[PDB]
Structure 1
Amino acid sequence: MASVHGTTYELLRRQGIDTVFGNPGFNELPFLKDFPEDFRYILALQEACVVGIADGYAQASRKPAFINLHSAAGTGNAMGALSNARTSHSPLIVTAGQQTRAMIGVEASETNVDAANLPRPLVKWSYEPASAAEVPHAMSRAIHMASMAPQGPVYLSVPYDDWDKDADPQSHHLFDRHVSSSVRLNDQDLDILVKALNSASNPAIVLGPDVDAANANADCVMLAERLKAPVWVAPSAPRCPFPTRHPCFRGLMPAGIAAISQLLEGHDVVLVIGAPVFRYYQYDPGQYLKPGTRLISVTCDPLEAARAPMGDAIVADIGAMASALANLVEESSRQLPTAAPEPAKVDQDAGRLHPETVFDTLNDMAPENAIYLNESTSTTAQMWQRLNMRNPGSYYFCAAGGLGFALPAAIGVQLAEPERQVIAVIGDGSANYSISALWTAAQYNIPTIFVIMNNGTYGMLRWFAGVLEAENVPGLDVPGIDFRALAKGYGVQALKADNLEQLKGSLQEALSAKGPVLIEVSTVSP
């Protein structure tokens, strides 16, 4: 008779899973014992760092990732990272261990109380099974709920005595099941949409993160060339969906109600693909749209379609809808739009560096197929203007605004794409939230590059206190941190850059190295 342990590892290998991300405990020892030789284990020193590494690996490979944590204390330390995963639509399977079934009622040490309620309201599905023989059917529901459109995180809690009991022999029917959500709009209604696009006199296009997740980038290039139309990215962007030096590209939209209606004035039809309508930030009251403009939206999430304050909407898969529209529209006889001008070069003495100077130097020296990550909050507009990104899968930024994402996520992307060089740009404030993730890069020899921007302050918060007219606020400055000593503590090589000739030398050394490297850069205090 096969055990619950033997039946569960056979379901995982037949559904394509071969890696476990974790930090271990008492309640997990009977799951992890006798570990099979066709799987690999990746250790990290804190639970915010475990979930960040797994999130980077899933976004870059376009497939689900598997995680194992300890009871209530371990699940609780990770709830900030699960807030970023809800808004990026990331497919993550989260498991945690519970006490033996005979000692839950007396509340022994290590018991998880009312367990399915702890991660609500951040997850798609949450459960604790009623018997040992139900555990393989519960793992089947979790795999399929994470992978169906719209994609997201899920939770399962298991008592430690279940793994050594006998399984149900009829569980073999689960092993090779296949589920599809790859759908598009009916022929009669799709015909009405194409006729409206073919007769517009001044059209415009807006793109979001679900375009890069689906690999629909090349189909969106064909659509803009046929219509002869300008292209923008939607506000607070988590990914890059279009080549940034193509003649149709206009850059990042402003995040206010009145600023967006003035930008769209004079366009008769506006088409949105794979974004919310819209992720606003500052308070800027006015009109949602001006007279003469109509809007149409395509999305994978029913909650996005319901909460929009203007326009018509369609709920379907982004890959199947983009392929259909690109191959049906006519070639317009209008002329192609003109490419944006070359950015201005700013004046630089032989002391402390301007942020504009750091981005121009990276664009001259790095390879054409590099991957970038951003957690430098006061410099985002300059980064989008000065880096040429030609290929898919080339940019990531925290999707819900939560700090502690970019340092551990850069280690996960480099393990999924071993032939492309990864480069993470991070502020002095943001670097402390997840500092212990540096140990995982040194132990498994993963060659990421980390660039630290040191200005001595929480820079974006001083800017916003100015616009709200708020005086005498405490806690805005962070003096007296040595980032070269923190790297030596966890086993990582460290370099420094105080002027332009030191910055050029340090980047050329880092491109040649066989292990991970950190560089500390002195930047101008606003």
Structure 2
Amino acid sequence: ASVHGTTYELLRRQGIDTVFGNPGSNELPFLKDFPEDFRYILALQEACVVGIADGYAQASRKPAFINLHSAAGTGNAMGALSNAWNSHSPLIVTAGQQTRAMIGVEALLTNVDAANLPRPLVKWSYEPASAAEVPHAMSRAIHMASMAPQGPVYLSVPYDDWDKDADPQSHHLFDRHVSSSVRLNDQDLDILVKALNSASNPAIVLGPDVDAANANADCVMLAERLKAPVWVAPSAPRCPFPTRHPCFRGLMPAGIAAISQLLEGHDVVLVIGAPVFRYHQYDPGQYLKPGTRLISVTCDPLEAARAPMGDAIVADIGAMASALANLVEESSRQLPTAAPEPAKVDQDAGRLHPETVFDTLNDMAPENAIYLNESTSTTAQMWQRLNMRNPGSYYFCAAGGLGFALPAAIGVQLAEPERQVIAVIGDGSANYSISALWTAAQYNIPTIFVIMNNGTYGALRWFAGVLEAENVPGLDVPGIDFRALAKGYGVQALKADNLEQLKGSLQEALSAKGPVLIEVSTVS
């Protein structure tokens, strides 16, 4: 067998059947004789390739496979890799290298010092020392991406390797099963359970690894048994809990003082599947107030190490959430009362308040819709106004890197063909990965894109306001016609200048057979 044949066999035996890519000459020997059981998803720029693959992996809860062109293709994807690192996305990033005979002279398209290029944004990064090693290196990449804590990995392959003879002993790679589905030992788990049972006023904080593990239902059971309020950890990349469940208390503000104040009076705070904590704004104060102790369950040693407070347990989130939910006592305390419905913001017949947009989406979207958020100034309102009952219903750029939601919404929609994906994206954010629209059109992936157009980088205006910063350049983005951009890439386009038009546009979009972009005129 060839390295080509052996590698594709390894991929299929490990459950991989799709290649997300933007092709180049170093990759042609890999892509030739493309197997008939595989699918190739083209995107026009590598931030888009990786964003699509990322959405697909996060929603499918399985690794996604990417093929990029040498250093320039890899480089174009590095902002996207920053998000993937923070979301623990299992991405296998491969990049084609020059033929081994031309690496020394640094021919055009040589990826120099290749394994160093994507660092520090990957778990593992490698170029094999010989062609016959390629299948083994691919095996390493698959498992490194897939083991807890999941994350992106990088493999560089000289293009002449594919046609070489594979090692017959590579067959041992095909069916390897590698598990990190582990939980705390019985003795120490019993200690933890007793601490939860004994708490007088417990609180629960959940992060994105809960949703990645599909541990949501177990966390609901856990919260119900403990009669505990549930918050989502700050800067949330995913939604780990039904947002209208009586225990739900919403998204935590991303500040040190804000969080310790919120947790004041809670004697035991159990954090599951989150860093402690993904703060954002400067908000100095106490990490925790006197009387509060924190216990973190995390899949990631790097998270456990850097928490400034609390105890930690490094284990699989699925296994731990299931064990805790099934072991804790039913508390005799009263179940928390549901948060009241949000207020309706006054809305005239002109430009849309973001609150109006979210209320209308909530009214009209199916109960199993999936939302993506890259409308950076409206996140708090979005979290309050969308009833998200089901797992896998929310995605937000985990490293704050713009250019995620537009392509990721396409990957999510590909992963979940029966759940309507609705990406709510600011006019600024929409540009970073605008060319991803083409992939939705070409493959008829029926994502709905809602562009919140207020003509400015709104979140930056706000942060500048709090800093009291005068004379900041580059904050306005006037003069972008999003309907024309959509037309450019073959996506049906609608405009909503007021509420009547918003409802009409959403009705049309929800009824459409392909992707649709709606440009919404929102208040400055």
In structure 2, what is the Cα distance between the partners aligned to 1:79 and 1:267?
40
C-alpha spacing 1:505/1:175, structure 2 compared with 1 (3 Å): same
In structure 2, what is the Cα distance between the partners aligned to 1:241 and 1:468?
32
How far did residue 328 of structure 1 move?
1.7
How far did residue 352 of structure 1 move?
1.7
In structure 1, what is the Cα distance between the partners aligned to 2:357 and 2:204?
32
DSSP 3-state at the match of 2:378: helix
Larger mean CA deviation between 35-44 and 52-61 belongs to 35-44
In structure 1, what is the Cα distance between the partners aligned to 2:109 and 2:332?
71
How far did residue 413 of structure 1 move?
0.8
In structure 2, what is the Cα distance between the partners aligned to 1:310 and 1:288?
7
1:182-219 deviation digits (Å, cap 9, x = unpaired): 11122222222222222222221111111111111111
DSSP 3-state at the match of 2:441: helix
How far did residue 5 of structure 1 move?
1.8
How far did residue 110 of structure 1 move?
2.1
C-alpha spacing 1:35/1:468, structure 2 compared with 1 (3 Å): same
Larger mean CA deviation between 506-515 and 396-405 belongs to 506-515
C-alpha spacing 1:335/1:28, structure 2 compared with 1 (3 Å): closer
Larger mean CA deviation between 82-91 and 347-356 belongs to 347-356
C-alpha spacing 1:30/1:243, structure 2 compared with 1 (3 Å): same
How far did residue 157 of structure 1 move?
1.4
DSSP 3-state at the match of 2:120: coil
How far did residue 242 of structure 1 move?
0.9
Equivalent residue number for residue 392 of structure 2: 393
Equivalent residue number for residue 314 of structure 1: 313
How far did residue 36 of structure 1 move?
1.9
C-alpha spacing 1:110/1:338, structure 2 compared with 1 (3 Å): closer
C-alpha spacing 1:346/1:172, structure 2 compared with 1 (3 Å): closer
C-alpha spacing 1:34/1:331, structure 2 compared with 1 (3 Å): closer
In structure 2, what is the Cα distance between the partners aligned to 1:6 and 1:71?
22
How far did residue 270 of structure 1 move?
1.4
In structure 2, what is the Cα distance between the partners aligned to 1:187 and 1:275?
23
In structure 2, what is the Cα distance between the partners aligned to 1:103 and 1:191?
60
How far did residue 78 of structure 1 move?
0.9
Query: For 1:394-413, what aligned pairs fall within 5 Å after superposition?
Result: 394-413=393-412
Larger mean CA deviation between 212-221 and 168-177 belongs to 168-177
**Higher Rg of the two aligned structures:** 1
In structure 2, what is the Cα distance between the partners aligned to 1:463 and 1:328?
45
In structure 2, what is the Cα distance between the partners aligned to 1:84 and 1:424?
17
C-alpha spacing 1:244/1:129, structure 2 compared with 1 (3 Å): same
How far did residue 19 of structure 1 move?
0.9
Larger mean CA deviation between 142-151 and 158-167 belongs to 158-167
C-alpha spacing 1:471/1:172, structure 2 compared with 1 (3 Å): same
In structure 1, what is the Cα distance between the partners aligned to 2:10 and 2:212?
26
How far did residue 346 of structure 1 move?
2.2
C-alpha spacing 1:195/1:108, structure 2 compared with 1 (3 Å): closer
**TM-score with structure 2 setting the length:** 0.97
Equivalent residue number for residue 504 of structure 2: 505
Query: For 1:153-164, what aligned pairs fall within 5 Å after superposition?
Result: 153-164=152-163
How far did residue 452 of structure 1 move?
1.1
How far did residue 395 of structure 1 move?
0.5
Q: Any stretches of 5+ residues in structure 1 without a counterpart?
A: none
In structure 1, what is the Cα distance between the partners aligned to 2:265 and 2:27?
62
1:39-66 deviation digits (Å, cap 9, x = unpaired): 1111111111111110011001111111
1:426-478 deviation digits (Å, cap 9, x = unpaired): 11111111111111111111111111111111111111111111111122112
Equivalent residue number for residue 367 of structure 1: 366
DSSP 3-state at the match of 1:184: strand
How far did residue 290 of structure 1 move?
2.2
Cα-Cα RMSD: 1.4
How far did residue 392 of structure 1 move?
0.8
DSSP 3-state at the match of 2:148: coil
1:55-85 deviation digits (Å, cap 9, x = unpaired): 0110011111111111111111111111101
In structure 1, what is the Cα distance between the partners aligned to 2:469 and 2:25?
50
C-alpha spacing 1:374/1:171, structure 2 compared with 1 (3 Å): same
How far did residue 374 of structure 1 move?
0.7
Q: Within the alignment, does 1:381 sit opposite 2:392 as a pair?
A: no
How far did residue 100 of structure 1 move?
2.1
How far did residue 492 of structure 1 move?
1.5
Query: For 1:59-74, what aligned pairs fall within 5 Å after superposition?
Result: 59-74=58-73
DSSP 3-state at the match of 2:182: coil
In structure 1, what is the Cα distance between the partners aligned to 2:345 and 2:8?
58
Larger mean CA deviation between 146-155 and 110-119 belongs to 110-119
1:263-293 deviation digits (Å, cap 9, x = unpaired): 2222222111111111122222222222222
In structure 1, what is the Cα distance between the partners aligned to 2:257 and 2:282?
10
In structure 2, what is the Cα distance between the partners aligned to 1:168 and 1:75?
28
DSSP 3-state at the match of 2:377: helix
Equivalent residue number for residue 130 of structure 2: 131
DSSP 3-state at the match of 1:472: coil
C-alpha spacing 1:524/1:328, structure 2 compared with 1 (3 Å): same
In structure 1, what is the Cα distance between the partners aligned to 2:276 and 2:189?
22
Larger mean CA deviation between 147-156 and 248-257 belongs to 248-257
How far did residue 166 of structure 1 move?
2.0
Q: Any stretches of 5+ residues in structure 2 without a counterpart?
A: none
DSSP 3-state at the match of 2:122: coil
In structure 1, what is the Cα distance between the partners aligned to 2:346 and 2:438?
39
In structure 1, what is the Cα distance between the partners aligned to 2:29 and 2:284?
58
In structure 1, what is the Cα distance between the partners aligned to 2:36 and 2:289?
63
How far did residue 125 of structure 1 move?
1.0
In structure 2, what is the Cα distance between the partners aligned to 1:440 and 1:404?
15
C-alpha spacing 1:494/1:180, structure 2 compared with 1 (3 Å): same
How far did residue 262 of structure 1 move?
2.0
Equivalent residue number for residue 333 of structure 1: 332
How far did residue 153 of structure 1 move?
0.8
In structure 2, what is the Cα distance between the partners aligned to 1:449 and 1:117?
37
Larger mean CA deviation between 314-323 and 261-270 belongs to 261-270
How far did residue 349 of structure 1 move?
2.1
1:138-167 deviation digits (Å, cap 9, x = unpaired): 111111111111111111112222222222
In structure 2, what is the Cα distance between the partners aligned to 1:421 and 1:170?
45
How far did residue 348 of structure 1 move?
2.1
In structure 2, what is the Cα distance between the partners aligned to 1:277 and 1:487?
40
Number of corresponding residues = 524
How far did residue 117 of structure 1 move?
1.4
Larger mean CA deviation between 372-381 and 156-165 belongs to 156-165
DSSP 3-state at the match of 2:333: coil
1:390-421 deviation digits (Å, cap 9, x = unpaired): 11111000000011001111111111111111
DSSP 3-state at the match of 1:83: helix
1:290-330 deviation digits (Å, cap 9, x = unpaired): 22222211111111111112121111111111111112222
